[PDB]
Structures are given as C-alpha cells and as structure tokens.
Amino acid sequence: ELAGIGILTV
Amino acid sequence: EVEQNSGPLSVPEGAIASLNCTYSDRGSTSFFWYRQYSGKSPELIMSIYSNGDKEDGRFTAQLNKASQYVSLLIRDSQPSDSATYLCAVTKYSWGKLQFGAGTQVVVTPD
Amino acid sequence: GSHSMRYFFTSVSRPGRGEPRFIAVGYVDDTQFVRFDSDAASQRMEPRAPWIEQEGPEYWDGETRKVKAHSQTHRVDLGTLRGYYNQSEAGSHTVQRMYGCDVGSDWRFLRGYHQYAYDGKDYIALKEDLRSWTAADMAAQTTKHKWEAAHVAEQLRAYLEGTCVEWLRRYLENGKETLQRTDAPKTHMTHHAVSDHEATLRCWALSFYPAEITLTWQTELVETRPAGDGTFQKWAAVVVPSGQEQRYTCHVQHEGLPKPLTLRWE
Amino acid sequence: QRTPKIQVYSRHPAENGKSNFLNCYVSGFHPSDIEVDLLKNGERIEKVEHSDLSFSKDWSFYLLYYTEFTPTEKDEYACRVNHVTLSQPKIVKWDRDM
Amino acid sequence: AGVTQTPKFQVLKTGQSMTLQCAQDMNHEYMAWYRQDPGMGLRLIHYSVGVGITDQGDVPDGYKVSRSTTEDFPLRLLSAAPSQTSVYFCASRPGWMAGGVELYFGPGTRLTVTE
C-alpha cells in the first residue's frame, strides 16, 4: 500500500 | 466525524492539562491540534503522524491508531493557556481537514 | 525469514512528445503484485498477483489516487531538476524513487528505505534512522532544506514504521501460499571438455524460491535469473584438469534445503 | 551510462520437441530506453512478452523478455539488444547448457 | 503579514447581500472558507486549490466564491438568512505538493443576520 504522505516535489 | 468533549476543563496553574479526541476513519494519516483563544483565530500548535508520543515545548501529543484516539498534554499550565483546543484529522496530504468542536481549557491562577 | 515490501517509481521525460512516461511497480520480496503505467488504457493500479485481487474497490480507488499523486509530483520534479542542473529542454531525463520496509522472521519492523535518483545517480536519501537526509551535490541541498522544513522525514517515518509494516503483514497472510513457500533448488551437473588436458564442470540450480542462494566450488558465476514462472536459476563453473574431476565438489545453500547439498561429478 | 548485461536461456532444460520458454534477461543498463529481440535463425520473433520496467539498488534497470517455443536440432536462437551505450547491436546466441 | 479579512464585524438584515474580503501575500496556492457556530467546530464552505479553480465544501449553499488572483478569495453572500449568522474564517497554505500542511487563518468575521 502506497504512501499517502511525505511524497513531495523536490 | 471527529469527537471531542466540550468541557470546560478546569486545571490549576503548573498542573498538566489532559485533552483527547477520537476519529472514525481508520485510514487517517494526519492529526493536528489547533489552539483558539476566545474571540480569535485558530493556530496550529501540534502535528503528529506516528503511533506513540511526540514532544514539542510544553506540548505533548499522543496517537493510537488502533484505538483511534489522539491526545494533547500541556505541561506547566499557565493562565495564558486558557483557550479552546481543536482536534483536526485528515487522510493523505490532499485530504480535507476534519475539525472537532474543541475542548475549552480554563487555567486558574495559583 | 525476513520479508520486505518495496515500491519502485520511474519517470522519463520525453522532450516535445507530450507527458513524461511514468512507471510504478510494487513488490513483496521477489514477487511483483501491483503496477501502474501512464501509457496503459486502464489508468489505474493493476493487480499482478492473484492474492491482491481479493482486495475491494476502496483499495484500488485509494491506490490509483495515490499513484496519480506520485506521478504528478515527479512530472513537476523533471522540470525543477532540469533547472537545478541548468540543462536544456532538448534532452530526455530520468528520475527514480524507491521506498519500503523490512520485517524480521517475527514480522516486527526491521528497517526502512526511501531514496531518490536523478539520471541514475544518488540525489537525496533518507538515512537509516529515518530522521535525516543524505544529499549528494550542490543541487540536492536545496531540496534538502525544503524537505527538512516541510517535515517530510517525520511523515515518511510514520508510513515506513507503520502503514508499510501493517500492510506488508496483511499481504504475507493473504498470499501465504505464494509468499511463504520454500521451493528447494533442483540440482544437476554438466561436464564438457575444453581442451585435451582440461574440462569444464558446471553446477546447476533450478526452480528455486526465493532468489537468495549460494553456489560454491571446492569460478565462473552468472547472476541469479528469473525462470519466468516465479522461480529462479543459477549456475557456477570451474575449469578442471582432465582426470581430476572427482576432486571437485559443488555446494548448494538455500532456505528450502533442510541441510546443504554436496555434488561431485557422478 | 551503463551497458546492458544479457543472458539467454530456457525456462526448463531444453529437449527437442518439448514445449519450453526462451528467455532474454537484460540488466544493469541506464537509461531505460532499450530494444530487445528474440531471433530464430537470424530473424525476428513476433509473439514476445516482456516484464514491467523495474530497477535495482544501484538504480539500473532490468527486464525479462520471453516467448514460448519448441526446440529442434536445426533451429538457432539468439537475443539481440540495442541501447545508447552500444555502437552496434549486441547479439547473444543461445547455448542450451548456459 | 499573514491573512486579512474584511470586515471583522457585520450586521445584516434578511435578504441583504454582502462580500467578505480575504487577502494573503504569501503566494499560497490554496485558500478556503470556514464557518464556526457555537458547539459545532469548523465546517468547510468553499475552497480553491489555485487561480480560477474553486470547489464546494461541506456547506456551500447560499455562498459563492471566486479566485481571480493568488492573493484574493472573496466570499459572496447571495441573500442573507438568519441561518447564516456565524463567524467566518479565511485560511490559506501552500499546495500540498510544495509541503503545505498548516492552515493559516485570518482574524475572522463575525456576522449577524437579524429578522
């Protein structure tokens, strides 16, 4: 199950 | 659905204020506590994501995803901490924030 | 008996040819169970394993929504990164992200990962404590400051030590027949002369799972390869003086074996 | 840039007249743009499936190309790979004990 | 400078129309309107994830918003009803891709609709 937080543009 | 006891909670100066909050969506990922002085605007004081405890200044937040509750502890209570504390819960970064009705805290002078 | 869940994300820019290509795949151990491809027709998370299909629509709605969000940020990443390194719009470039968790033989949290690459080189990476970042060059530092201030590490740490682990356990159970199996390698040995005075001995390991294996001659060593049916293959060779074939033994170590095997030319 | 590493082999040990699968495993290359062909007697095979693009800890990509086939005594099989790092295509011939 | 609203207090008669200003100079992509009624906590009315883009919240009926620029996000009351008596908060933050999480609230607008 994928991460729904902490994934942001660089 | 984010649930809070309305209070008010009456706590002596220097004692530890104990607030809690329950939410119904088990998939929730982000948990927040906002503070709102009477006749003023809410302002973020704590955020928490992992199970267990997180500690920032006089504030401690506690999260239990299994029991679906989130708590806030205020150490060294001061009269100037008398306010309404709002519990806020969302799922994922883009999710819509869900707000509780808040618990009012009254910190009485020593 | 440790297990892992691992996600891989690839984004390749296609100059003057529309949207960037985006590829996501999900693994439990050596077994892929989901994928998303921006060029496919479905435009959804797709099952790649029989045991994940029992999941209902809410799961697939959730995963499609997150994976799309993943591709949006990486789309923007390509533009931003091109700027950081002062590159022209004329060329294709690649960004890659991988993350996930490991659990021990007790299914307790063991370790966590999150790494980012630009054009195949280490860009920025979450350290082992899951509380700080490793940034390579001058350009990655700006991303580091941004992500520090946005508390990214706190967020990823909560996922890796929590959601990732909880679901990894869920998958292991639902696909226990697939994922918690030990197929011991089927072994045999080959002999071929390479000269009038020396010969080649080749030790074969076939149809085993998982991929981890040790092949030892007591050496030419090809890397473990997939069979295509969910199992793996490997071999190891030695050049031996003819007549002295009997002096050499091949040794095979694998989880599916109660005790290690020994093979000599017979 | 990293050049592809190629292995050609069958899913099962090959026996003439027995159904099998011919595999071409490419790995360790960058970027991901790659063309892989399975050849029978020097010409391209059409019904060729492939795995979904993934990569390893070192960030290099890998793919499995594969097709169903029935070995005979006369037929020669090979794998042809072309990539930015290769000046001319590279062809690896299938040796059935490797 | 944060988030400003205008006016902070307002009395209206039933049927009257009014626009609540909200401005922000922090280049926030995301803005939203909330209302607070005694004992309920915050309910989302409208929000905007960017210029020219707006969508309905939990309770959008009776209200309209626009987003012509990054800075401004006005809330229009069509025909004031007693039910619309409340405190209205404007809030903003960067978009989530940029790391936006905390909502920055304006001072609030206390609005009374008399019969």
Side-chain angles (χ1 to χ4, degrees), chain B residues 32 34 36 39-44 47 49 86 93-102, chain E residues 34 36 39-44 57-58 89 93 96 100-108:
Chain B
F32 311 93
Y34 283 80
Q36 200 191 18
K40 288 275 182 178
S41 55
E43 165 199 9
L44 174 85
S47 70
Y49 300 92
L86 310 184
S93 310
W94 50 88
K96 62 185 293 290
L97 217 37
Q98 188 48 256
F99 277 99
Chain E
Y34 288 89
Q36 182 169 45
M40 290 199 63
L42 296 186
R43 288 183 306 183
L44 181 72
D58 284 346
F89 285 102
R93 64 157 170 74
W96 67 266
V101 169
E102 168 180 12
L103 289 181
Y104 298 86
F105 285 87

Side-chain angles (χ1 to χ4, degrees), chain B residues 14-85:
Chain B
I16 295 180
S18 162
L19 299 90
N20 52 58
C21 161
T22 65
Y23 62 98
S24 51
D25 192 343
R26 188 171 189 77
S28 299
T29 67
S30 319
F31 306 87
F32 311 93
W33 285 96
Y34 283 80
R35 180 180 63 203
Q36 200 191 18
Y37 295 119
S38 196
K40 288 275 182 178
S41 55
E43 165 199 9
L44 174 85
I45 58 165
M46 281 292 305
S47 70
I48 188 176
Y49 300 92
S50 321
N51 264 19
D53 289 16
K54 184 191 179 179
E55 180 179 307
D56 185 23
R58 297 194 317 278
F59 299 127
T60 285
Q62 307 176 329
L63 174 62
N64 189 324
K65 283 177 189 226
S67 299
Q68 314 197 162
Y69 78 78
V70 48
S71 301
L72 175 67
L73 287 177
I74 314 181
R75 277 167 292 99
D76 296 341
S77 293
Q78 299 163 331
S80 72
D81 296 343
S82 300
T84 307
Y85 290 87

Side-chain angles (χ1 to χ4, degrees), chain C residues 161-180:
Chain C
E161 303 179 345
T163 313
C164 184
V165 158
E166 295 152 12
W167 279 96
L168 172 53
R169 297 191 194 117
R170 271 211 61 188
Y171 297 153
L172 293 178
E173 195 65 22
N174 293 345
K176 56 186 310 169
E177 299 77 17
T178 291
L179 303 168
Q180 307 176 238

Side-chain angles (χ1 to χ4, degrees), chain D residues 5 23 35 39 41 49 65 68-71 77-78 83 92:
Chain D
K5 281 167 299 174
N23 291 332
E35 286 191 11
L39 312 178
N41 304 324
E49 278 283 0
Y65 280 69
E68 186 168 59
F69 81 119
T70 297
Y77 290 90
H83 188 258
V92 179

Side-chain angles (χ1 to χ4, degrees), chain E residues 39-76:
Chain E
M40 290 199 63
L42 296 186
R43 288 183 306 183
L44 181 72
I45 303 169
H46 286 285
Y47 67 99
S48 162
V49 303
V51 175
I53 311 170
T54 88
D55 213 329
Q56 293 189 354
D58 284 346
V59 283
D61 276 25
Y63 312 86
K64 295 187 181 188
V65 289
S66 66
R67 188 78 187 279
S68 319
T69 63
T70 304
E71 303 84 78
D72 313 289
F73 191 51
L75 180 75
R76 289 118 63 187

Side-chain angles (χ1 to χ4, degrees), chain D residues 22 24 36-39 44-50 64-68:
Chain D
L22 183 66
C24 188
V36 179
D37 307 280
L38 294 180
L39 312 178
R44 200 155 71 99
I45 300 172
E46 262 59 43
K47 291 186 155 180
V48 178
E49 278 283 0
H50 64 88
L64 181 66
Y65 280 69
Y66 61 96
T67 183
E68 186 168 59

